[PDB]
Design brief:
monomer; 221 residues; alpha/beta; 8 strands; 39% helix; elongated; binds ligand 6M3; binds zinc ion
Length: 221
């Protein structure tokens, strides 16, 4: 008696509670992100961030863009958020002249599209390719990333080599005049002779983040 109607109501309750849960999670993430963004811990610690988690969707799009330029460098922007000492990259878009209003209005539509599925994301960094010479920051890249870690903070610099296996680097510049201790050669990389000077000189003005990769529930399609 009312067994059929009970099943429908139970399904409806299950669906209504999922939506409410999604909204609650988004709102908790938003306030938790507004907390750290107003706190700015990265301004005091210079080795604050240590990890970079990249979604398979963001990697797919970045590698596709990188390949499309062939021998020529390519760049774009990354969407994500902060989680303690970890920079999370969830999505990315290619770049791209009156003004870069397009790069600003694209960014807003990605955040909005993600909001609909209950995903909290914002501009977290920039990516670019080094076709054939490896993952590191050139002198021009270090000057760019130092300025980014002033005006665009929190901001990460991803470098992809689409020619040679999983050749991706995630980096953070140190501030002008900051002398850090210890040694950081980590993984060995074969870079050309005509780039080794630019490499070795600036190779201490920044550091590498520990890159990890993840597939989200939404990043399965
Ligand atoms: N913001 C910033 C910015 C800074 C530098 C570059 C270029 C520049 O140095 C030229 C040599 C190759 C290079 C290797 N790494 C960086 N670059 C770029 C750049 C500009 C157009 C297309 C692709 C990129 Cl990657 C952007
Ligand atoms: Zn570069």
């Amino acid at each position: 008696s009312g067994s059929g109607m009970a099943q429908k109501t139970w399904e409806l309750a299950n669906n209504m509670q999922e939506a409410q849960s999604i909204d609650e999670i988004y709102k908790y993430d938003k306030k938790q992100q507004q907390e750290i963004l107003a706190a700015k811990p990265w301004t005091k610690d210079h080795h604050y961030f240590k990890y970079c988690k990249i979604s398979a969707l963001a990697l797919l799009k970045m590698v596709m863009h990188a390949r499309s330029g062939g021998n020529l460098e390519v760049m774009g922007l990354m969407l994500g958020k902060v989680d303690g000492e970890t920079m999370i990259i969830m999505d990315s878009f290619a770049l791209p002249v009156n003004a870069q209003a397009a790069a600003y209005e694209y960014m807003a539509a990605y955040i909005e599209n993600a909001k609909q599925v209950g995903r909290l994301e914002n501009a977290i960094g920039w990516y670019h390719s080094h076709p054939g010479y490896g993952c590191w920051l050139s002198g021009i890249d270090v000057s760019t990333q130092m300025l980014n870690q002033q005006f665009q903070e929190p901001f990460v610099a991803v470098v992809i080599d689409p020619t040679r296996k999983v050749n991706l680097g995630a980096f953070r510049t140190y501030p002008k005049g900051y002398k850090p201790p210890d040694e950081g050669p980590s993984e060995y990389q074969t870079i050309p002779l005509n780039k080794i000077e630019d490499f070795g000189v600036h190779c201490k003005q920044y550091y590498a983040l520990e890159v990890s990769y993840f597939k989200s529930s939404l990043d399965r399609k």
